[PDB]
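pls ignore typos typing on phone
S-adenosyl-L-homocysteine + seq
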Amino acid sequence: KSMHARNRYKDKPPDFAYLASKYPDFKQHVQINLNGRVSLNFKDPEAVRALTCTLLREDFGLSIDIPLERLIPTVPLRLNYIHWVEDLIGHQDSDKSTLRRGIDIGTGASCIYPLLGATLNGWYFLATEVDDMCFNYAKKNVEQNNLSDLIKVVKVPQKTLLMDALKEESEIIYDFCMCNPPFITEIMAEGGELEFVKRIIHDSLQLKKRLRWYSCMLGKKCSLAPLKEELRIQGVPKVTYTEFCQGRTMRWALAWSFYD
Ligand SMILES: Nc1ncnc2c1ncn2[C@@H]1O[C@H](CSCC[C@H](N)C(=O)O)[C@@H](O)[C@H]1O
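k done
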């Protein structure tokens, strides 16, 4: 399955030529290809950073500052997750009177899911990070876009996930959590992604209805089936999944709930 139908980049892909004409810091990172078209080297982190900062500024009015030494997100791909969560929670069929409350697990230096969700929909976020650099940058990025009344960035300890974040300080009910990557013997090892999502499932079995939906965007096709099986085993009553992509960058979205 392709881009989300409501993704703005579905039928308006980024125009490199337009962006080069308007943004001189972006222009210094593009070149002309064989076809005579403005292009970008997607293996150069400086160029990828410029594209991402430029798109956020152009299409969302967001100014962000991010390091070369931490993950640089790809904006069109992230929007698919935002629109999917919108579908999960019934966002299209409600109005502004309903405030929504999300958790972004491992928000990254860009704090991108909360910035997009707060900007587009006025959603609140608790945004967690274990990494010091990512935490600091995420926090500057929220503050420089004046979104700290909607987005609370928190450094959490290394070993913790959802439960340790949600105590007497917490909101009673959250609408969703979000999470994406990175995360002789016959038996294959679980690997990083499968282990990590299983920690989310484990916390969800304690929290139950304190969140309306648990979700995670998977980077590996092979994660999906064993995650579904673990959910079946545990009696989780409502499971849904789908797929999204931006060119070759593929994702498998999985969400579950303890509500009927
Ligand atoms: N248990 C945990 N709690 C919070 N953040 C975590 C975590 N384990 C890993 N992370 C963070 O998860 C991130 C990688 S996965 C999420 C990527 C993020 N949405 C982005 O766009 O950058 C890293 O920033 C890492 O520091």
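Residues 71, 73, 105-108, 110, 112-113, 128-131, 134, 156, 161, 180-182 surround S-adenosyl-L-homocysteine (CB under 6 Å). The longest strand covers residues 238-246. more later
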